């Protein structure tokens, strides 16, 4: 079986389609699946005019024949009686079906040739070889030999069209093999069972038996879904459809998906009972080991970035690939601060209240569970997020990028060691090297939270891709600035300086500007535009300014665009309320800032604006959590739930209600029992 | 045949000459599949090809008269 991977399909030369009887007929048994049939034939004529070697093996003649025979038998009775067989249908259907195929194909210039066979024809070797050389000749002549079994005179380990197709594919020595059947694939139990798990690849029934048999002779077998649209062009498209069949890539190559997740769940439950300074000691040891074997990891990083450099794929990426013992020291000290602050994050009380005699309760913090972080290779965060997990005592699934994968593996074994030290388990599992983002993205019930961290491309591709799963992270940092008629100019000057000039590539970086039109005449417009020129900032403009000015800067494509570089649209309005309108109209509710000296307008703004965060005489670059004294954050959430913007450690917990009644019961508290409600909010511990 | 059968008689042709038609088709193809350089100077194959095409032709012709046919190889 030369081919082994669903990219290698691009290069199959000789392939053998095989349609099932379910494909041809409908459920009404009143015709054909003409749409499906002609679709298959169009795909085959395409993939053959390409140059490939293709030879269908049909089926379902008897169904068509039965339709025809029934109609005739109706049409041949006495009108009196109207007022109250394998071989026959076989032959009739064979004729009509060949005619139909022939018209359809000749619509594409190609030519066909019926070839009927029987079972004993395989037992005579000479017959077998005559058939073989015949088929090879036909194919060599650019012909599409539509094979079938001579059921018309001799109905039938060849016991079907399927085993037939297998034996053929072997003898013909073809590349591929497609059993376009009724069902869509394979599971470890019927759909009306437990374990509806698709066998997108198959390691190592009648269908499956033939699959085994043939696959043991050099062919590469597939099984698709007959009713699955654009089947063949997509299988050749390489995309994972149906149950591909190849040999094993066992855990020596990769644990498939889940065992990692469940191992992580288990170890999370383990460390759940390992609170008091256990994980603190763990992160202490981890920072130590980070500063103790950096030479190894420095050299791994150096070599891996040097390897990636020959590709030269992305200057931002290749620059983030920088790693030096300065960053190592920064990571170590941040992790030390994590160890410090992470003392009593978990298992902490929130409420203390009694309802009845000896009937108290509380609502206690608790890890979230299985976390899947995803990020372009910025390996500096790997130990960061690992420390976050092991402080929060929740498991963590890891999947970065192919870049720096070796350095990532180094960091991974580092942290795995440091955790196995105390924790009794590597309650963490990395996986990389072609981890089919969409697939595990679709998998549910084990993962909890998607944490994209790489860059805006990642978060976008996720949001558009992610479906039915808690995600995090913003989509784009379309910040907004407003300056009031009650604001000194140089303030706004240095403010816009720190705003745009500081790091235009940031996510939380400003990309717009809004000014009270009243003060437009105060030369401040010119001041700021000239300052932007001092920084060489591309300036766009909007309808209000274009109306206002004569020559002016160029226009703007769309108010809801982001640049990431020295480009910032600028608009101007009269009304603070109008500012509210515009912001809410375009802004991502991500960030905002007010520069003014009156609080009345300022506080009205603040109370009215619905950003993720608002400010006063400050900088959008303040949005880093670490700047908030929040400790090591994990990301920036614009989602309307559970967390806003700076997401520290607490954004990685939930609560759990616990109660200890004596013998209490619900109906007991009703008037039928001497039980009351107290709701005395006991002072939390 | 369609006449003498719409009359009511019982008729069932037994054709021949598939290989000739097949040879015509095969020759044309073999021409159409050479390098333009070389252009400047088998029972079973023709059998099957002719069988297909011939059955198609009979089928169109007969269906022009309402009757229906059915290939039977032996």
Automatic annotation (TrEMBL), chain A:
Pathway: Amino-acid biosynthesis; L-proline biosynthesis; L-glutamate 5-semialdehyde from L-glutamate: step 2/2; Amino-acid biosynthesis; L-proline biosynthesis; L-glutamate 5-semialdehyde from L-glutamate: step 1/2
Keyword Nucleus tagged: no
Cross-referenced InterPro entries: AceGlu_kinase-like_sf (IPR036393), Ald_DH/histidinol_DH (IPR016161), Ald_DH_C (IPR016163), Ald_DH_N (IPR016162), Aldehyde_DH_dom (IPR015590), Asp/Glu/Uridylate_kinase (IPR001048), G-glutamylP_reductase_CS (IPR020593), G5K_ProBA (IPR041744)
UniProt EC number: 2.7.2.11, 1.2.1.41
Catalytic activity: L-glutamate + ATP = L-glutamyl 5-phosphate + ADP; L-glutamate 5-semialdehyde + phosphate + NADP(+) = L-glutamyl 5-phosphate + NADPH + H(+)
Binding site for NADP(+): 434, 456, 475
Aspartate/glutamate/uridylate kinase domain segment(s): 14-225
Molecular function per GO: ATP binding; glutamate 5-kinase activity; glutamate-5-semialdehyde dehydrogenase activity
One record GO biological process: L-proline biosynthetic process
Domain named Aldehyde dehydrogenase: residues: 250-557
Highest taxon above the source species: Eukaryota
Transmembrane segments: none
UniProtKB keywords: Amino-acid biosynthesis, ATP-binding, Kinase, Multifunctional enzyme, NADP, Nucleotide-binding, Oxidoreductase, Proline biosynthesis, Transferase
Cellular component, GO annotation: mitochondrial matrix; mitochondrion
NCBIfam families xref list: P5CS, PRK00197.1, proA, proB
Family membership: In the C-terminal section; belongs to the gamma-glutamyl phosphate reductase family.
Protein name (Swiss-Prot/TrEMBL): Delta-1-pyrroline-5-carboxylate synthase
